[PDB]
A paper describes a structure:
Adeno-associated viruses (AAVs) belong to the Dependoparvovirus genus within the Parvoviridae family. Because of the broad differences in their tissue tropism and transduction efficiency and the absence of pathology, AAVs are the promising vehicles for therapeutic gene delivery. Adeno-associated virus receptor (AAVR), which is a glycosylated protein containing five polycystic kidney disease (PKD) repeat domains in its extracellular portion, was recently identified as a key proteinaceous receptor for multiple AAV serotypes to employ the post-attachment events of viral entry. To dissect the divergent rules of engagements between multiple AAV serotypes with AAVR, we select two AAV serotypes, AAV1 and AAV5, and solve the atomic structures of their complexes with AAVR by cryo-EM.
The cryo-EM maps show that AAVR PKD2 alone (without PKD1) contacts AAV1 being similar to the AAV2-AAVR complex, while PKD1 directly binds at a completely distinct position on the AAV5 capsid. Similar to the binding of PKD2 to the AAV2 capsid, PKD2 lies on the plateau region of the AAV1 capsid and interacts with the inner rim of the spike surrounding the icosahedral threefold axis. Each PKD2 molecule contacts two AAV1 capsomers. The βBC1-βC loop (including residues AAV1A263, AAV1G266, AAV1A267, AAV1S268, AAV1N269, and AAV1H272) and the βEF2-ɑEF3 loop (AAV1N383, AAV1G384, AAV1S385, and AAV1Q386) of capsomer A stack with strands B and C and the BC loop spanning residues AAVRS425-AAVRY442 of PKD2. Residues AAV1D590′ and AAV1T593′ in the βGH11-βGH12 loop from capsomer B also stabilize the virus–receptor interaction in this region. The binding of PKD2 to the AAV1 capsid resulted in a conformational change at the βGH9-ɑGH10 loop, which is the counterpart of the βGH2-βGH3 loop of AAV2 and has conformational movement upon AAVR binding. Wt AAVR binds to AAV1 with a KD value of 13.9 nM, which is higher than the binding affinities of AAVR with AAV2 and AAV5. The mutation of AAV1N269 and AAV1T504 completely eliminated AAV1 transduction, and the AAV1W503A and AAV1D590A mutations attenuated transduction to 30–40% of that observed for wt AAV1. These results are consistent with the structural observations that these four AAV1 capsid residues form extensive intermolecular contacts with AAVRV427, AAVRD429, AAVRS431, AAVRQ432, AAVRS433, AAVRT434, AAVRI439, and AAVRY442 in PKD2.
Residue numbers in the entry:
A (entry chain A): 219 to 426
B (entry chain A): 219 to 736
C (entry chain A): 427 to 633
D (entry chain A): 427 to 529
E (entry chain R), F (entry chain R): 407 to 497
The structure:
Amino acid sequence: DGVGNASGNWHCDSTWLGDRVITTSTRTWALPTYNNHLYKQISSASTGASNDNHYFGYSTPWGYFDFNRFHCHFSPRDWQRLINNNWGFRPKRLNFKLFNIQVKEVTTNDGVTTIANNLTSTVQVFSDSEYQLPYVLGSAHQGCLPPFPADVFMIPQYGYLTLNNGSQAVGRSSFYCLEYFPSQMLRTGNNFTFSYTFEEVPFHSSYA
Amino acid sequence: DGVGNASGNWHCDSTWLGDRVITTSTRTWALPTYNNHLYKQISSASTGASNDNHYFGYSTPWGYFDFNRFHCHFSPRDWQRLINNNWGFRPKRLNFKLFNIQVKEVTTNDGVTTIANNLTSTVQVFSDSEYQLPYVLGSAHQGCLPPFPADVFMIPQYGYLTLNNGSQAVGRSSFYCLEYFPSQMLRTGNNFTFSYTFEEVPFHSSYAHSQSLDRLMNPLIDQYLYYLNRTQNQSGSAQNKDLLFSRGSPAGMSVQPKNWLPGPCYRQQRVSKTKTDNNNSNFTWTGASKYNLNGRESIINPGTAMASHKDDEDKFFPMSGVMIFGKESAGASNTALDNVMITDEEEIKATNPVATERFGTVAVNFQSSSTDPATGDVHAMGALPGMVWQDRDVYLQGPIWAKIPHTDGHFHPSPLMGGFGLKNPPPQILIKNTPVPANPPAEFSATKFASFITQYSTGQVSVEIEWELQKENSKRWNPEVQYTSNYAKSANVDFTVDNNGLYTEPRPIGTRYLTRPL
Amino acid sequence: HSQSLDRLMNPLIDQYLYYLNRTQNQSGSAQNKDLLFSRGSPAGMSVQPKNWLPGPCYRQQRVSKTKTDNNNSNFTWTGASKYNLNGRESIINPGTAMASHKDDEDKFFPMSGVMIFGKESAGASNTALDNVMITDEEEIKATNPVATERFGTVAVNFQSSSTDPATGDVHAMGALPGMVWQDRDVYLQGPIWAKIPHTDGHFHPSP
Amino acid sequence: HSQSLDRLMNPLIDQYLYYLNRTQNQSGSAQNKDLLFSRGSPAGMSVQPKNWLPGPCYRQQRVSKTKTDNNNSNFTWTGASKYNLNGRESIINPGTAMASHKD
Amino acid sequence: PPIAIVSPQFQEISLPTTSTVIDGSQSTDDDKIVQYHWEELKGPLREEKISEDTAILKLSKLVPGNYTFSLTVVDSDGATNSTTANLTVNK
Amino acid sequence: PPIAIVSPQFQEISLPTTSTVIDGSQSTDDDKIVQYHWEELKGPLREEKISEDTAILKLSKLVPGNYTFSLTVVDSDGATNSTTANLTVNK
């Protein structure tokens, strides 16, 4: 509850219980302004790519968090501690938290950037917990949490591809406006939290 | 409860329950300083306009919110989801919220604007919930919530017109000082909320009659009422006048005794969209339909609810009888035919007449042996007993409500631009930056202030209208005609953004796609 | 109604409202235009301020039951009242509720403004005058107009010293505020009900 | 009413509905019929799409109180508004609710 | 002054159809205009003049030639402005 | 084909009253008819022709003689049928 109060603490534990391991990881992020706040479409007709490399899609100003690599959670010692005495592992539940938001604003007055702290500006966060959107995650992209915890990372830009007849747009090509979802306005004192429980996915066979 | 806390969240849902749909919409606004905080009067004597274009009024520094278009609430999918399976809709209640106010203040020091965040400055908001003010809303102006949710919009300026003897001011001309109302001072941590419940306005008929009005009979059985078929017996030589009646009709349907009448009419001008089949004059204002009110003429535009043209006459449109929405790349002066959207109105051809066509022919004289039965041609027709009609279609762009003016009498108060005629409409929410002055001099001065701090506000605003739907109860066999997207390899997806982020609505969408029998 | 609509006043007392009786003083030579108002009326009943109005009108054609006083054309469909709906014409038939004829004009009937019931020995094609039953509608002469008659005369121009006050002739009249009328009579043969069509608006839904 | 019926709009903002402004393009020679629509209006108020209509009308005769600007006939009953009821004519008097004269 | 403007100054009417309108109703002012006054400069005779003291003309029975009318407006208080119109009537 | 039928073919108009109607609106088809087209074969000049491209005529100023008009209808798709009318106009 800001402004002169932290809205969360730095947790980066990795606790090893008997039959379960809890791997917390906390990173510092930085979200820029993409497209200057525009839903610019993206296709292949501008560049003129190959016949198998045609696409059609949209490019939002939204940005996503993709903690979808294993080193975003396991240090190399914790990975070694896992793979040497375990015939398997699967996740039970996750717990996502987003705190200590600082909204700076930059003035490039006469070639000199003077970054000024803004206090009344907000930050919209929503978790698409009903899967109405294209699920870009799992396509093995960059922009994850970094491996090493003392790294500031930059959030990706959420674009999505839909159906095309080449670089055209068939009448099944869906457009997703992302302010047509209930987001959560976050000032410099608020925080975004939610929780999630995985399915009963089988154990990954970590044996030969 | 600021300053380091948001005073509200972004809600932009659209939930579809059984018999009701709740369409929340939240936009980001920006309110400048109008007139530099002055109640400057406005009249026509400065410009020197025409005799029908004289006005007199006032122009406040207040600004209003006008969520009075349908796309401020319905996404094009939600509009499609509504108009395809609904015989009607009306609003129940709205819920207005105004949060996350940020009052910036700009310093143009040596040609360089340095926008600085101000924290102690306030913002006055009041909702005129007792209707003491002129109700500018429903006059189909700009400055609404934008269609696409990711658009920052700029709030209009509240001006109002009163009575005039030209560009003069009669002694009935009211002046409204708007700080003489209790506003609400809002810092950067407060929020304005109020709620409103609509009247029991009738459902907007979102269907098209699948039967004509002059085709409401059994096509097999003939009637038991007779009529005059023939006033001249053909005995192969000359006139006889034997007055032959005969029963009917199964087939001579145009002469039968009907039971009802088509609606009122007031003819517009038949104008082709093809330029080669129009008169070479100008035209408009020469051959337009217009009315004298206090000795000044005004085009009807769009007039009473009438159909646009006959069967397969898509090139014609009434001169002022159609909604003409502008596209982008359309200026506010002398735009061509391509950059506008003339709303074709043809689903009400059953009950309503055609606006470019006469509403029948009355007789003039008395027929006898001496004089032939001359008939006159009807053009305008007030409401007879037994007329049925159907009101003008609404659109995704067009207005939602209007205010029924508080007169002593009014006939069928539906607004001529379409929508819900409300006696007590949603109240005007007026907003204004509190004037923060610059440094006063050391000696006391009587003159008010010639110097304020230039500032403006920004923030978010949520409007949440709950609608009441009328689910269809049809026993039609064959499929309906419903609003579909064009399934083709297209260059750009309709009702979406472009290569550089311009939300372009490609076509006006009505609401009359379903078929109820008459 | 046992009283007319333009006869709703006390035949003895005169009113307190005045009106314009005369726009030309008779000084036995020429025009003067002195604008003489005078009170009334106990006797000049046609010029008084009434309070209500007769009903809507839409003229049919005056057709005699006697064949010798009809035009030698055909007529119908040439001089009939009809309406354009989706670009196809249809006779009104029987139209709005109006009276059939004036006082002691039983030979005339509106061309399509009366119920015409068939007798027996009446075919379904080109029957003569004897085998039908034209329903005379005359009990509503008080409130309603006559279907073969104009519903008054409006003025066209502006009267001045230059131009004479020309008046135009009204034939069709939509409902003004303050009109009263009375609906069409029912018959032992005629229909009982009808369905009001499910439209968005309808004015006085009597069939 | 302290507002007119054809003056029920915000005098500052222009509408979003278009209309036909011009059926003849001025290319300085002759007729073209290009059907020019344009938005409005903040100022061309007489041509905008209004929403309501003025009341019913039934014209009386314009008669001056000054005797020198009246026709030299009589007038009344010659050029008056009157109605046929059962075949006898009667002056409307005072007719429907209308204003007496212009500004 | 009282500034007046006529509909076009220049019209083109095709024969046999002779029925036109000169619309001197876009003439402006800073106040009301009391009356609009039409006159005539050129042209042959035998025309049905209708309402020269009004706003919108209703011209009929036009000989192919050169007509030239003139609109004159009057402010309160009185101020005149005469702007003319030409009627290039051709077959 | 497009079959057309005129009101009578044969009329009898008595002088001085010259104002008649030829009703070519009972002309049938299996589809709609796009337009009705009137023409003229016989007769002297100086008549006020009103709306030759319409359905119901409004004929005026008829010299006693022999007029002969002709109705022509056009189906979609195009098919013509010319049926004529005679105007036996007598005093």
